[PDB]
Structures are given as structure tokens and as C-alpha cells.
Amino acid sequence: MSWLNSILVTLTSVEPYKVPVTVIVTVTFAFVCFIFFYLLRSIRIIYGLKKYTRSINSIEKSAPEVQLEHLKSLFQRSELKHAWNAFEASLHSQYELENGEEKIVRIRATAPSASFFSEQQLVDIPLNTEFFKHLPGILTGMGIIGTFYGLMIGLNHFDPSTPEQVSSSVNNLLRDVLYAFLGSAFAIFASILVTWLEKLSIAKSYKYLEKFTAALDSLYDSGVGEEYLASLVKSSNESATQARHLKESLVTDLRDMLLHLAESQKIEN
Amino acid sequence: MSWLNSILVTLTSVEPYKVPVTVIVTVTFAFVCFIFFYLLRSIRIIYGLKKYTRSINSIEKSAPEVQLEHLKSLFQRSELKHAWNAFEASLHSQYELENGEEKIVRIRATAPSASFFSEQQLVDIPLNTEFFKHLPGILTGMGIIGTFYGLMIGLNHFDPSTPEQVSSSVNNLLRDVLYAFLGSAFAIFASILVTWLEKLSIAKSYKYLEKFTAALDSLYDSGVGEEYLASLVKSSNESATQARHLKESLVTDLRDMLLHLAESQKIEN
Amino acid sequence: MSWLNSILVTLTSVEPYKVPVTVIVTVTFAFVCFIFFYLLRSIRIIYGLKKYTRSINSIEKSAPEVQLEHLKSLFQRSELKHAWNAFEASLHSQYELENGEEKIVRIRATAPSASFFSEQQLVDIPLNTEFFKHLPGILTGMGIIGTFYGLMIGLNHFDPSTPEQVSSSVNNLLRDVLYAFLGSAFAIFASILVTWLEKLSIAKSYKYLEKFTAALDSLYDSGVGEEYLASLVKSSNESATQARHLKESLVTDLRDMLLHLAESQKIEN
Amino acid sequence: MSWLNSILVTLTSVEPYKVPVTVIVTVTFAFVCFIFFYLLRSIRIIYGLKKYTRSINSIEKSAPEVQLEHLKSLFQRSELKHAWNAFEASLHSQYELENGEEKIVRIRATAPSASFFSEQQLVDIPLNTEFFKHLPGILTGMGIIGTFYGLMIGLNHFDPSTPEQVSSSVNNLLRDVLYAFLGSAFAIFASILVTWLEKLSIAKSYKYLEKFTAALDSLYDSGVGEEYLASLVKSSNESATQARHLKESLVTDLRDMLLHLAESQKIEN
Amino acid sequence: MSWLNSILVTLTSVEPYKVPVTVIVTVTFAFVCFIFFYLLRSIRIIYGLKKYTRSINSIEKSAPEVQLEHLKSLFQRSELKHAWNAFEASLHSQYELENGEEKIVRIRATAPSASFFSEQQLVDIPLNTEFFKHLPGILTGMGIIGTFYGLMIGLNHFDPSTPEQVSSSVNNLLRDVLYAFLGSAFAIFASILVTWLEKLSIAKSYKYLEKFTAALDSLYDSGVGEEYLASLVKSSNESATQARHLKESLVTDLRDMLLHLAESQKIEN
Amino acid sequence: MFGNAFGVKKRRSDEAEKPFWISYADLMTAMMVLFLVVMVASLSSVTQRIQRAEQGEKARGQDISRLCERLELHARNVNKNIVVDCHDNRISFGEAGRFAHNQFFLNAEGQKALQDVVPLVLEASNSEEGKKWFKQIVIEGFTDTDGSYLYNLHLSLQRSEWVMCSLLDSRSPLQKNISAEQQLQIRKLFLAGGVSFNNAKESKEASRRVELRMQFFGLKDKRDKADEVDFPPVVNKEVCQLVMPL
Amino acid sequence: MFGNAFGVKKRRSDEAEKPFWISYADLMTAMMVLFLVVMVASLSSVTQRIQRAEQGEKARGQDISRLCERLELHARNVNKNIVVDCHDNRISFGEAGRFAHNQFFLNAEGQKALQDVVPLVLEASNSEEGKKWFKQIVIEGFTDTDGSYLYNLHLSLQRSEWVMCSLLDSRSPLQKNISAEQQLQIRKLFLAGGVSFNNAKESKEASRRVELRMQFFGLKDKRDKADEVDFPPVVNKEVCQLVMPL
């Protein structure tokens, strides 16, 4: 196919220095994209999570209603609004009648806060970790493409026709290999650096998200259905007991009242 | 072995330009299949999820029967009909006595909407993510096969007998491997592009599915069992109190009728 | 050392054609084992899932009993008998007294059907996915072993020690490297073929297992505990009301009886 | 500095054959450790699981107390004692009053058997799969280290100070490369074999563990809470009518009593 | 290009020996960081978990309040205090009346201890496993970079002007390759050593954390809700029987009072 | 029913890049580097003798070019008639060296050019480059193939003898500005004789010319000492034996 | 609490292997093999170039030595006075080639030897080795360093001219013995050379001698028609210039 022959002849003639330049520019663009879309956003998320955790720990000793108001005001303005709404919907408010009004005396947790402030929604989707965990491999592939191409250019240009041309051919081949190795070096160093930065940032993100969800989970205690069932069982037991006692008391009252009626009838007679 | 030499002559008799074209055509077919069956499908899924979330957020303030009927009509002619049917079967409707009839005043959620509009059913199964996440590896493998085949073509025709034959054989081998690496570089570029597109699409699909399920979850409140148990405990306490008060009232009234009967019979006497 | 030298002599004395031949034979055997134990097995599983789903959808409008014996006959004589027994043990039968006998009027679901017809038990264990997901890596490793061992053989042949026989050494080295790369290319080809087939099969198996599970889920409705709790709450409210009304009615009856007794006493007087 | 040159002189002073010997010995020791701590252990686990499953299937038709005591004896002189204690603690015993004493009539399961006889506790932790799934990488790394060391030795020996000494130097360097590649290939072959055996053992262990947990799950039925709620609803519905009937019967009996008293009073008067 | 030449002359301006010294120093620093932040931390975690398990096993035969106090003091001043607080919030204490006041007779678990003493919170976060599991790849990549950078230095300084300059440049290139071999061998050795230690530590940590959570789960039994429901059902049946018995006893006793009143009236008359 | 809402979990923990592949890429890169550097070393070693010979040849070429440039600059500075062709190490006197038919004389321009160029070549040879690479000066004679061979060759040799006489004849202007050492050097560095046939020019009159062509030592000769001979000091002035009046 | 313990599990998907370090390692295996093949092939090729050049030069030298050997054997067969030296590619006259003062002609034995050696040179140039490497024959004149330099130079030139006349004189036996083609070959081969004064050991009888030496092409030289000067066919006899009474 003549088109393939034309492409081959037109890319044998590419200047060898243009391949490391292309690799370096593309890898630099990928690294800048990594910094903008992953590292800065991860730092921002970590700082926000730490601020949230400090805010939650400041109402550990507050009343349930003021705690709810504080958390609503904390989360209603930020991206963690629907997660907070779901978490609050999962909460159970216990009411006790005080001074003729029903007031929330305790709030109970029916599900862990991590089921609403999930690692996915709060970290993975915002940071595109699913993709950025492949970025070091992308950089490695760019490096191998550039390196293999540069070494191929050097090898095509290497042809000592006589023993007297060996020196210049060796020099040109070494220059070409230098270009290819520069491209490969930058690409692989960028890959390693991106791996280091992204793994450290994702570890910190997960740690501080766990701290945040643990702070949320410590506000409200679970197991409200178990205590409701225990109260029901107790109330049933004293319900049988009180039924028996009420029957006995009614019998005693009826006996006494009938004796009084008999005495009154005797007095009248 | 004669069979090995026979297949090595058949495979190395292919024109060297046919390795890059075979690799490029196969990788392009895989990429077109990826676009058609994964990327466009994911875009349609994301668009539909956005439209559904817009529709659900418009019936936030509606009466529970009205919004139930709206959601019903929203999904029957849709691909989410089965998921909506399961979700609606999981709903708990609370009836109250108005005008001598039991009408729904509140519809409750016994299970989260994500349990039915799951990531699997709505994204992974439609997009065949169990397969397409391994496509970049397949493209890379096909590129590697192309390079190895070009290398084998170059090696099988190498003639080192004479220096001129050495030079011509080196030239031919480098040319064949250069065709092959054209194919392989195309494969690696396509693998990178497929990786980026696939990860981004899965990210956005999960993000907007989460938004959709959060919109659905906000319509119906959970935790109705805990409310029922709390009501049962309160009713048990109030029923014990009512039993004691009713016994006391019965005793007082019986005293009253006995006194009245005594007075009447005294008057008759 | 004599031991290592004898080992090297034994390894490098084999005919160089036996390396690609051994790699190809072992990879072909692994591929045939994959076809027999994974691909055909997955096809049979998918066909059975389709048949079961078609059978389940046929009793979508049947009576709860008729559905129950139909599902018993469909499953208890197959490989899903234990899963069906577990799922049926999870089913809750609601009884109603009609015509002097207790009959099932409704069957409720307490757990999802995917809990008992799980992906593991129905797909991953019969397909031995814990082993076959690693098979492409094993094939590629075998190709790499062939590459290394063929390179050793070729480098062993390269010891001319005479300019007259240098060309023969180069020919032998080229042939041995050609053999090694034949084996490696075949191994990589079969690795990507196995990857393609196994991922497509596992995706289709998950798709149709999800359809089968959805078909089972649609038969029975959940949330029976919630409606039981609602019935208990309603009954407790009506119980308090009926208790006070029966107290009032007992008071009225006692009053009427005492007036009648007074009237009879007046007649006697 | 000169420290680097000194440690290079020390490192490359060893004979080339000692490197493949060391690699082979270390890789063989690691393989023997794999066989001892992993493969034989997994075989013993599989045999024990099959024996336990056979034992459990024998008591399928026994009385609940007989089954419970048989399972206690089965898993008390065994490594599964903690899992069995947890699973038995999760079992609900239904007592009924027979012959004046509370006797177990049915045992109900509240959690799946695999929740306590989990894959981690029975397979992953005993086999240390968190370590042994990375052993092939360690073997390959050891082989690569040996290859690098042998290449160091061979390159150090390479010094063609004379045009006539070039062929001998190249041949010796190729021999050293052969030794290094021998070490690498042995390590890679051992890694592939270890991967094969490990993955097959994991697949078989998971299969037979699932069979064991399915045998345990089939003994006892779940959903006891739902039938408890159904019984509660039935009791409340019956108790409303029972209270009404008791009140009516008490009123009728009191009417008959007062009529008899009036007749006796008439006779006495 | 001028920019490329300037970058090359700046990067290559390093003395050839500082590239092996850098890889070795960087790899050793990474290994020391691994030892300090992962291995010593993991050893302390394992030792603490074993001591905690011993303490828990020592308290298994004590009273519920004594066990609670021992576990409070055990974890309150440690890093497991949040996990213990969550676990105790998940505990359900059963109160009974013994000599006038409420006394805890039993404590029941509503969730497994591993829900709060999770592998994440207790091992993966404090050990930064999400980072350190990628360290060996970083080390190997740092070996590859060092190879590339040393070869870049060697190739950029090749001087073909004079035959002895050619000899010096050739010797420098050979020394650079020896340096690259040494650095790569060191990096891979450290990477596999880190892998071995990391995976051994993580396996031991998981094993002993599982032992710790199994020890905690042994203290308290689950399934208290089913017991409460069974008690409620038994109480409902006995309450129906008791109400009927109370009505019968009441009507018989008032029959006794009415007969006694008639007899007394007859005697008085 | 009573299922635990607070369950044991496990996140999406992605497993790292397999160590074997990065290690094997490192090993393959190291092997490729090794083979490149071994090829470079082997090719340099097998051709190091060729490289040394080529460097020596280039150095000799540079030295010869420098000497030719110096001599040409001296000729330009002193006598414009002297033109030197450095491509083939030739000194030409075309206009002043035209020879008429059946004669071996030249105009005064040729005599001035020769007596002016001889000291320049002497001082060039006395330099280190001349003392290391400059051999004796070869006299060129050109003849045509037409006519009688013997008569044309006799004309050429008479021309050469006349040139040698004019170089070393008594009463010559060159001898007035000469020393004994310079005369001895001229006698040593000049040899007479040589006939040639060429068809590279379109004019038969072009062959009627005399040109000075110097030759240089070879690399493997390197100024052998035993080749040189000696001459007794000049005692009587040289007298030409050719027919000056004709 | 209100959830179910019999819930769905395994909600995790298997990760795909990273394919890019695999591509790096495999492409680097291919490039490593490329460099190994290029290393071995280039080493073999360069060594073969060097050995081929060395053996070509050796074969040329052996053929030249064989040509000198056969020429010397033929010379000994014809006349025993001819001295052939293959160690410098020169043929000299032992005793017949000597000259006295004011002498420009060889003796009768010298003339006979000069006439006899020419057909031997024709046979040498007619051989395959002659067709491959044989070059022209320069004639060097030698005279004692004593006496007048111009007198010695003119006498040597006269001797060389007389020798070439005896080669090509119509009255000489060579003209009536050789043919037109042989005459053209002689014209191509024999030509006039320089004059030397290599006098040593105070041997005036031996120093004043004239001999012919054989040069050859270069190994890197190229044969072309430009250097192949072809003389016109003989249309008239040639008469020598210097006359007997001189």
C-alpha cells in the first residue's frame, strides 16, 4: 500500500530531537492536568473535611436540637448537602412530654454516617481517582512510544558502509539514543512522581474522611429498636401484673361496698 | 520439526506493510465498538439520569398520591420500569382516617432507592463494564503482537553471509519493525484514549446515578419501623395509665350507684 | 561448579525448535482447558438462566401456591436446589382463615433473591473465576519463559572463535531468537484471546443472572414487618378507644340493671 | 566516590556461577516454604471442609437438640470452635411447653452461616493469602536481581583493549549474560508454577467452603421475626373481639344474676 | 533545538557517580521511611492487639458491669477509644430488678465488633497502606530512572575527536552501564524486601485483629430482638388466657357475693 | 428483619502495578543499554587502528593545506605572477611559462617568477612543517602525442635543462641574492627530469608550459634518514651547457 | 436493625491489570533483541570489511611479487647480466650500465641488454597482473655529486635521451622487431623520469648508472580512460636528436 510507504518514508525523516520535545511537552501537560484536577482538589477536600470535623467536635456536648441546627447550617451551603439530608433523614428523634410540649430529648442513629458520606461520592468521584490511578501508566506508555521511536530512528540512521565511517555513525547513534533516553527518563520520572503524590493524597483523603464520619457517628447512639422492644416486653409483664392487681382490688372494693349496702339495709329494717 | 518451519514460512511471508494495517484495522474496530457500545451508551444513560432527576425534583412539593402517579408514569415506558416496580413495591403507605375513609397521607421508604436503581443494573450491566475495563490491555496486547510479528518478519529474512547482505538485512529488519511499531504505537494511543474515556464515563455515570437515587430518596422518608415501635411503647404506657384510671372510675361510679340504690330503697321503706 | 555447568549443558543442548513448540503446545492446552471448563460452562449457565427466567415469568400472574409448587418443580431437581431451598425458607407466607381453614393468600419476601442466588455460588464458583482470571498472566509468563530460554540457547550457540564460522553463529542466533519471539507472540495472542472471551462470558453471565434474580424478586413483595407494625399501632389505638367505650357501656348496663332491680323492688314493696 | 568503586570491586569479584546457584537455591527455598505453609495447609483445609460437610449432611433429618449437640461436638475439638460458638449464639431456639416443661421444637437462623464461617477466617488468614498472593512477584524480583548481578560481573570482565581481543570479550560477555538469564528464567518459571498452584487452591477452597456454609445454612430457617410479628397481629385482632365478647358475657351473666336475686327477694318478701 | 541542548548540558553536568549514589540514597531513605512509618507501627499494632486480646480473654468470666468497666479502662486512654465508644453504643444492656434498683444482668451485641474495630480504621489508616502498597513500584521506577540518567550522562559526553578520547568515552560509557546495573539491582532488591516485609506485616495484622474482634464478640450474644419478639408473643397468648380467666373468676366471685347477700337478707328478714 | 445496619465493610482498594513487569522492563532496558554500549566499544576497538590512521592522514592533510596557504599568501604578497593550485599541490606560471615552437627559453616574466618563488619555497621548507612533511621538488614536463616523439621530448628536456640552468647559472640575478647554504638547499631539494602526456585541456599550446609540483612524505615513510645524501661545497660557479645564443 | 442480615454481598468488581508497563517491557524486549542483532551483525560486517581490505592488499602484493619473480626469471633466462630487485621494484644493470666521464651512450653489452629486456617487459605488461596493476616505467639518472652540478645533470639527461632513442630509434633493432601495437605499448609504458645524485662509498664507477624501476597503481586508485593516453598510429619514422659527433 503506497500510503503506508509514504508514511514510513515521511517519519523516517523526522528530526530525532523532536521526539523527546514532544514527549516532554505532552508529559508536562499531563502533569499540569494532574496538579489542577487531582492534587489541588484533594488538598481542598482534605482541608474541608478537617474543618467539618472541627465543627462537629465543637457540638459534642450540645443539645440535640441545637446540634441538628448547627449541622444543618454547616452542610446546607456546601456540596455535602444531600449527603447530610440523607443522614439526617436516617436519624430517629425521641420525644418526651415536658411542660405540655413534646421536645426532642435524644436523637438516635439508625445507620452509619459512612453510608451517606461515602468514600466514592466525597473523594473518588470528585477527584476522578478511577482515572488518575491510570495516569502513571499513561505516562509510561508515552515514554515507551517516544523511546522506541527514537531508538528506531537512530538504528535506521546507523549504517557503517566502510570501517572508516564507524566513528561518525557511532557518534550519531549515541546522539539519537541520548534523545530517546531523555524522553524515556522524563516520562518515567513523571510517572513515579505522580504515583507518589496521588497515593499520598488519596491516603490522607481517606484518613480524614474516616475521621469526619467517625465524628459524625459519635453524636448519636444506635439500638433504639432494641430498647423499644425491651420496654414493650417489660410493659407487657407489668401489664399482666396490673391486670391481676386491678381485678383483685375491684373484688375487694365490691365486697366492701356490698357489706356496706347490707349494713345499710339492716339499719333501715 | 517440519511443521514449525512451515508455519514460520507462512507467517513471515506476509508483506511487512500488512502488520501495521492489520493492527490498525483491528484496534480501530475495537475502538469503534467501544464508542458505540460503551461511550454513546454511557452518554445516553447520563442524559436520561439528568432528565429523570429534573423530573423528580419537580414533584418534591406534590401530594404523595400525585407524585407516586407521576413517578409511575415516568418509568413504565422507560428502561427502568423493573427497578421502579421493585422500588414502589418496597414503599410503605401510611393511611389515616379522614371523612370515614382510609386515604394515604404519607408514603415511606423501607429500603434505599439505590438498592433498586443500583449501579450494577443501571450502569455496569448496560455498559458491560465487566468487559470494557479490560479493553486497553487487549489493545496493548494487539500492538505488542504486531511489533513481535514485524520483528519475526525481519529476522526470518536476515542474511548475514556477506557485509552487503548484512547491511541490506539490517535495513529490511529495521523497516519491518518500524511498520510493526507504527501499528503498536497506534494501539497504545488508542489504549490511552479508551482508558481516559472509559474512566471518565464511568465516573459521570456513577455521579449522576447517585444524584438520581438521592433525588428519589428525598421524596420518601425511611425509619417508619422505629416510629411504629416508639408509638407502640407510648401506647403501652398510656394504656397502663388508662387501665388504672378506668378501674378507679369504675370503683367510684359503682360506689355512686350503690349509694343511689341505698337512698332509693330507704325512701321506699 | 560442575553442577551448574552440567545443568546449563543439559538446558542448552535441546533442539532450539522445541522451545516454541513446547510454549505453543502448553498454551494451546491451557486454551483448550479454558474453553472446556470456563467458556462452554458459562454458555450452559447462561442458557439455563435464560430458561429459568422464561419459566419464572410464566407464573407472574398465578396464585401464590401455584407459583410455589411451580418454582419447587423448576428448581429442586437442578443445580439450584439449595439456593431455592434457602430462598423459600426466606419467604414469608401470610395466612387468612377462609371457609374454616388457613390458606396462603400472599407470600412475602424477607430477603432479596440475589442473597441466595448469588453471583459467587451461581457463576464464580462453577466457572472457577478465582483461577481463570489469572490465566492470561500465566500464558504471558510462559511466553516470557520461552523467550528467556530461547535467548539462552541462541547466546549459547554464539561462540565462533573464528571469523570463518561467525556467519553460522549469527544465523543460529537469529533462528533461535525467531523461535523465542514466535512462542512469545503466540502466548500473548492466546492471553488476549482468553481475556476477551472470559470477560465477555462473565459480563453476559452477570447480566442474565441479574435478570433471573429480578424475575424472582418481582414475584414477592417485601416490607411485611412494616405493615405488621402498622397493624399493631392501629390496633393499640383502637384498643385504647374500645377499652374506654366498653367501660362506658358496662357503666350504662350496670345502671340499667340497677334501675330494673329498683323497679322490681318497688313492685314487691 | 571511591567507596562506590570499592563496593563495585567487592561485588563483582565473585565467580559468575555463584549467582545462578544462589538464585536457584533461594527460589527453591521459597517454593518449599510455599508448599509447606500454603499448599499442604490448603489441602488440609479442603479435606477438613469436605469431612465437616459430610458430617453436617448426616444430621439433616435429626431433632433440633440432636443436631445442635452433634454440631457442638463436631466444632469443639477443632479450629472452627470460635466460628461455631458465634454461629450458635446467632441461632434462635423456639421453646414450647410440652409435658409441663419448655422443650425446643425448632431452631431458627438469624444470620447466614458464611457471616461466621467466613472466607477470611477459614481460608484467607490460615493460608496467609495477604502474603502468598505476592510471592510470585518476590520470586521474579529475586531472579531479576540475580540477572543484574551477573550482568555486573560480566560487564566488569568485559575490556577489549586490543582489536584482536574483541571477539573473545564479546563471547565471554554473552556467556555471562547466559548465566544471568538462567537465573531469571528459573525464577520466572517458579513464579508461574506458584501462581498456578495458589490460584487453583484458592478456587477449590472457596468452592468447598461455600458447600460447607450451604450445608450449615440448610439446617435452620430464617424469618422468625416476621412470623413473631404475624402472631402479634393475629393476637391483637383476636384480643379486640375477645375483650368485646368478655364484656358482653359479663353483662349477660350480671343480668341473669340480678334476675335471680330479684326472684329470690320476691319469694322472701 | 537550543532549549533541548541547554537542558541536556545542564542535566548531564552531574558527575557520573552521583547518579548511583542518588538512587542508592533515595532508595535507602524510602526504605528507612517504610521501616519507621509502616513496619514499626505495624509491630506496635500487632503487639497491642495481642495484649488487648489477652486482657479480653481474662475478663470473659466476670459480671456484665465488671466486664464493661474493664473494657472502658482498657480502651479509654488508647487509640481505640473511638472504636470502643462506637462498639459500646452498639451494646444493649438488659436490666432486671434485684433488691430494689435496676441491675444489669446481661449485655447483648447488636453488631459485630469488626464493624467498629475495622481493618481500615485500626490497620489501613494508621499504617498508610493506601500509599505503602505502591512503594515497591516507586523504588523500581527510581532504579529505571537512574539507569536512564546515567546513560544520558555517558552518551552526552562521548568525545570522538581523538582516539584516546574515544577510549576514555568508551570506558566512561561502560562504567555508566555498570553504575546503572548496580542501581537497578539495589532498587529491585529494596523493592522486593519492602514487599516481603509489608505483606508479612499486613497478614499478621489482619490475623491478630480478627483474633481481637473474635475475642470481643465472645463476650456478648446477639439476637435480643428475636428474644423480645418471642417474649411478646408468649405474653400475648398468656394475656388472652389470663383475661378469660380473670373474667371467669370475677363472675364466679360476684356469684359468691350475690348468694351471700341473698342469704344475709333472708336472715335479716 | 433484625439485620445489622452497621456492617463490616471494605473499600475499593486498587492493587498496585505488578512488580514483575516494571522489574522486567528495567531488565530489558538494561540489556538493550548493555548491547548498545558493547557494540560501541567493540566497533571502536576493532577500528581504533583505522581511526588512528585516519586521524594521522587528516593531520597531514591539514598541515599540507596550511603550508600551501602560507606559500600562496607569500606569492600573492610578493609576485602576482606566481599562482599556486592547492587542490593537487601544483604551482603554475601559465602566462609567463608559455613556450614557443622549437624553443626552450622564456620571457623575463617567467625568470622573475621563478627566481622569486624559489626563496619562498625554501623558507616554507625550512619551517617545521617543511622540515617534517616536505620532500624534494619535482619538475613537470608536458608533451603532445602528435608529430615526432623524439623531437618533442628533446624540446621538453631542453626546456627542463634551461630551467635548471636559470635556477643555478652564474651571473643570474638569483645568485646575487643567494648564500652558500641557500644554494646547497636549492641543489638538494630540486631534481630535474620528467615527461608526461595529458588531454585534460583543449589547447595544444597549454602543454607548452612548465609547472612546479612538490610531493610530500608518506605517513609510513616519516623521513628516513639513510635516503639523504650530501654535496661538496660550491667551489666554482656553475656554467650552463645549453645553447644560449642558439 | 430494621435491615436484613441475609443481604447481598460480593459488591466488588475485579480490577483490570495495568497494560502499560507490560507494553514497555515487551517493546523493550524487542528493542533489546534489535540491538543484539545489530551488535553481532555490525561487528561481523566491520570485521569482514577490514579483513577483506587486508586480504585484497595482500593478494595484490603477492601478485606483484609473482610478476617481479617471473620477470626476473625471464631476464636471467635471456641474459645473465640483468639484475632484478623485487625488494624495491627495480631493475638495474650490474656491469654494462656503468658510464665514464663525458659519456652519453651504453657499451655494446649495455645496448644488447637494453634491447633484450624490453620484450620481457612487454610480456610482463601483457599478463593478467600487468592488465590489473602494471604502471608506467620511469627512468632515473644517477651521477656523482662531485664536479659541476649542471654538467652532471646535462650528462645524465643526455644519457637518458640516448637510452630512449635506442628504445625508439628507427635504426635500432627494436623498431624493426616490434609491431605497431607493441610500439604503442612501449610509448605508454616507457617515459622520462627525474635525475638523482645518490653517490656513496666513493664509488664513481657504480654511482654513474641509469636504471628503470617499476611502479604500480594504488589499491584505492581507479583506472579510467583519462589517464590512458593513446598515441596516433605510426605514420613516419623517428630520428634521434643528438648526433654522433656531439
Ligand SMILES: CCCCCCCCCCCCCCCCCC(=O)OC[C@H](COP(=O)([O-])OCC(O)COP(=O)([O-])OC[C@@H](COC(=O)CCCCCCCCCCCCCCCCC)OC(=O)CCCCCCCCCCCCCCCCC)OC(=O)CCCCCCCCCCCCCCCCC
Ligand atoms: C533525603 C534523601 C532522599 C530524598 C528522596 C526521597 C525519596 C523518597 C520517596 C518515597 C518516600 C517514601 C516514604 C514517604 C513518607 C510517606 C509516608 C507517610 O505516611 O508519611 C508519614 C507522615 C504522615 O503520617 P501520619 O501518621 O498520617 O501523620 C503523622 C505526621 O507525621 C504528623 O501528624 P499529622 O499528620 O496530624 O500532622 C498534621 C498534618 C496537616 O496536614 C494536612 O492536614 C494535609 C495533609 C496532606 C495533604 C496531602 C498530601 C499530598 C502530597 C503532597 C502535596 C504537595 C507536595 C509537593 C512537593 C512534594 C514532591 C516534591 O501535617 C502533615 O504531617 C502533612 C504533611 C506531611 C505528610 C506527608 C508526608 C510527606 C510529604 C512530603 C511532601 C512535601 C515535601 C516538600 C518538598 C519535597 C522535596 C522532595 O508524614 C510526615 O510527617 C513527614 C515525614 C515523611 C517525609 C518523607 C517524604 C519526603 C519527600 C519524598 C520525596 C518525594 C519524591 C522525590 C523527589 C522528586 C522531586 C525532585
Ligand SMILES: CCCCCCCC/C=C/CCCCCCCC(=O)OC[C@H](COP(=O)(O)OCCN)OC(=O)CCCCCCC/C=C/CCCCCCCC
Ligand atoms: C487480532 C490479534 C492481534 C491483532 C493484530 C495481529 C498483529 C499481527 C498481524 C499479522 C499480519 C497478518 C497479515 C495477513 C493478512 C492477509 C494475508 C495476505 O494475503 O498476505 C499475503 C502474504 C504474502 O503472499 P505470498 O506470496 O504467500 O508471500 C511471498 C512468498 N510466500 O502471504 C500470507 O500472508 C500467507 C499467510 C496467511 C496469513 C499468515 C498470518 C496468519 C495470521 C496471524 C496473525 C493473527 C494473530 C497473530 C498470532 C501471532 C503468533 C501466531
Ligand SMILES: CCCCCCCC/C=C/CCCCCCCC(=O)OC[C@H](COP(=O)(O)OCCN)OC(=O)CCCCCCC/C=C/CCCCCCCC
Ligand atoms: C532525587 C529525585 C528522586 C528520584 C531519583 C532517582 C533517579 C536517580 C537519578 C538522578 C540523579 C541526579 C543527580 C544528582 C544530583 C547532583 C546535582 C548537583 O548537585 O550537581 C551540581 C551540578 C553540576 O555539579 P557537578 O559537576 O556534579 O560537581 C562539580 C564537579 N565538576 O550543577 C547543576 O546545575 C546541574 C544540575 C543537574 C541535576 C538536576 C536534577 C537532575 C534530575 C532530577 C531528578 C532525576 C529525575 C529526572 C530524570 C530526567 C528528566 C529529564
